[PDB]
A paper describes a structure:
The co-crystal structure of the S9.6 Fab-hybrid complex reveals that S9.6 binding buries solvent-accessible surface areas of 450 Å2 with the RNA strand and 382 Å2 with the DNA strand, mostly through interactions with the VH domain. By contrast, the VL makes few direct contacts to the hybrid and primarily acts to constrain and help present the complementarity-determining regions (CDRs) of the VH. The 6-bp hybrid duplex is asymmetrically recognized, with three consecutive RNA nucleotides and six successive DNA nucleotides seen in direct contact with S9.6. The ten-residue loop of CDR-H3 extends into the minor groove of the hybrid, which positions a stretch of four consecutive residues—Y101, G102, S103, and R104—to recognize three successive 2′-hydroxyls of the riboses of rU7, rG8, and rA9 (RNA strand numbering preceded by an “r”). In summary, the co-crystal structure reveals that S9.6 recognizes an extended segment of six nucleotides of the DNA strand, principally through Y32 recognition of two backbone phosphate oxygens and Y54 recognition of deoxyribose via a sugar–π interaction. The S9.6-bound hybrid adopts an overall A-form helical geometry, as do free hybrids and dsRNA. For comparison, the S9.6-bound hybrid is bent by 18° compared to a model dsRNA.
The DNA-RNA hybrid–specific S9.6 monoclonal antibody is widely used to map R-loops. To understand the specificity of S9.6 for hybrids over dsRNA and dsDNA, we solved crystal structures of the free S9.6 Fab at 2.3 Å and its complex with a 13-bp hybrid at 3.1 Å resolution. In both structures, the heavy and light chains of the Fab stabilize each other through extensive hydrophobic interactions primarily between aromatic side chains (Tyr, Phe, Trp, etc.), burying a total solvent-accessible surface area of 1783 Å2.
Author numbering:
A (entry chain H): 1 to 133, 141 to 215
B (entry chain L): 1 to 216
The structure:
RNA sequence: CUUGUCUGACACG
DNA sequence: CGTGTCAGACAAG
């Protein structure tokens, strides 16, 4: 029942700092040392460092000294991490994993905070229906910053026969599509509605 | 600074079979304790990693006996017996022995399945986007295998490898299939200047390319 | 559960 | 040299 909850997404501009959170529940937050890891999207993992939550003594990866700063609020059971002088090379996913023994390897991991380092501004998405020329429909989310978007069909239903393709980046803009395959008995009679909810700018809903 | 190489970069296995993912290290990971702090981590698609083995062979709470770890010194092996479909994802070996803790390159375990042919679906631009001076032609290629497919785009009879976005989703836990999405983002002026649009898919599952087209 | 320990980390003196 | 906190392991009573 040891859970680890991190802060939500973050778009910061090249040159600035940012602090991340890691709430721990279900165990003595001060007992087990906290660990942080970095994984650029589509790449491998990389250990950052660990902080002794009882004394707040920190140990970093020498390549991360000057970038990361491990602190915490032992009373609120929340662990923090600070990244100064952000560059595009730092735009990745940062996890916080608890230590299993001797502050050497990890056992439990958080869901992961997604950091985005870019000067681009927040642009709301544009949803477009995908009508045919069983049948297959679609939903096109085009032109948005920053990630993330939530695309669901029928308020969460119709989870089967649906493929949500990862978003692609082009000219500081995102584009996400999702196809849905349903029985032929449905589209002319029963309607499939797309639900796009970009927490940074808007939330749109449109039928086919 | 010790590096971790994983011999199997990709490993296609059929359900029931066992897989051997090896992870040789750059230096000796044997700490003065006599203990080797070599781990194995699993990161299923769309999820954060989970610990599997934590000494060289010690199984963490949750893993069955199928997963066993062997090898000491600089050569290490992970054995996944009785492979399942919920075992998709990349496997990392992690050493908590020396100064900087370092992972390996990863290993993408692929579930070996029967050959499947894509279900190519094409969609003309939306009337809403057309009013917005935009016209995106989306192409869908779903439920196929292996992942070796090639998508082409033609405009009025001419290969257009220009302004094309391809999106690949992970291997389905249930279907064990892949699905691709290509889209050709043009302008309204550029779109209405042509009549016939196509996206083609060349796959092992078809001696001839799967062609879809329309003319508005 | 109790006793005798082994071990890694951090803080401190 | 030592001291404290923290955990994960142990053998034996």
């Amino acid at each position: 029942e040891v859970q680890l909850q991190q802060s939500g997404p973050e778009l910061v501009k090249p040159g600035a700092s940012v602090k991340m959170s890691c709430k721990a529940s279900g165990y003595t937050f001060t007992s087990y040392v906290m660990h942080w890891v970095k994984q650029k999207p589509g790449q491998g993992l990389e250990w950052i460092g660990f902080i002794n939550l009882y004394n707040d003594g920190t140990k970093y990866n020498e390549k991360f000294k000057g970038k990361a700063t491990l602190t915490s609020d032992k009373s609120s059971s929340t662990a923090y991490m600070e990244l100064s002088s952000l560059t595009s090379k730092d735009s990745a996913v940062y996890y916080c994993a608890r230590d299993y023994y001797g502050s050497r390897w990890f056992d439990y991991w958080g869901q992961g905070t997604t950091l985005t380092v870019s000067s681009a501004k927040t642009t709301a998405p544009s949803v477009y229906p995908l009508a045919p020329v069983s049948v297959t429909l679609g939903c096109l989310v085009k032109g948005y910053f920053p990630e993330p978007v939530t695309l669901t069909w029928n308020s969460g239903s119709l989870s089967s026969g649906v493929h949500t393709f990862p978003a692609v980046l082009q000219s500081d803009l995102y584009t996400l599509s999702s196809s849905v395959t349903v029985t032929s008995s449905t589209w002319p009679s029963q309607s499939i509605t797309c639900n796009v909810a970009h927490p940074a700018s808007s939330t749109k809903v449109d039928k086919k | 600074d010790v590096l971790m190489t994983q011999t199997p970069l990709s490993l296609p296995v059929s359900l029931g079979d066992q897989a051997s993912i090896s992870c040789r290290s750059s230096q000796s990971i044997v700490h003065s304790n006599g203990n080797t702090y070599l781990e194995w981590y699993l990161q299923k698609p769309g999820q954060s990693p989970k610990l599997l083995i934590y000494k060289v062979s010690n199984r963490f709470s949750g893993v069955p006996d199928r997963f066993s770890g062997s090898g000491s010194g600089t050569d290490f092996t992970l054995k996944i017996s009785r492979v399942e479909a919920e075992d998709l994802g990349v496997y990392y070996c992690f050493q908590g022995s020396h100064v900087p803790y370092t992972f390996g390159g990863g290993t993408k375990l692929e579930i070996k399945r029967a050959d499947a042919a894509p279900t190519v679906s094409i969609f003309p631009p939306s009337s809403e986007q057309l009013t917005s001076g935009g016209a995106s032609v989306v192409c869908f290629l779903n439920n196929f295998y292996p992942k070796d497919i090639n998508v082409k785009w033609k405009i009025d009879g001419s290969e257009v490898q220009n302004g094309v976005l391809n999106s690949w989703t992970d291997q389905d836990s249930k279907d064990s299939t892949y699905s691709m999405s290509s889209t050709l983002t043009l302008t309204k002026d550029e779109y209405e200047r042509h009549n016939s649009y196509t996206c083609e898919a060349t796959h092992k599952t078809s001696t001839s390319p799967i062609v879809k087209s329309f003319n508005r």
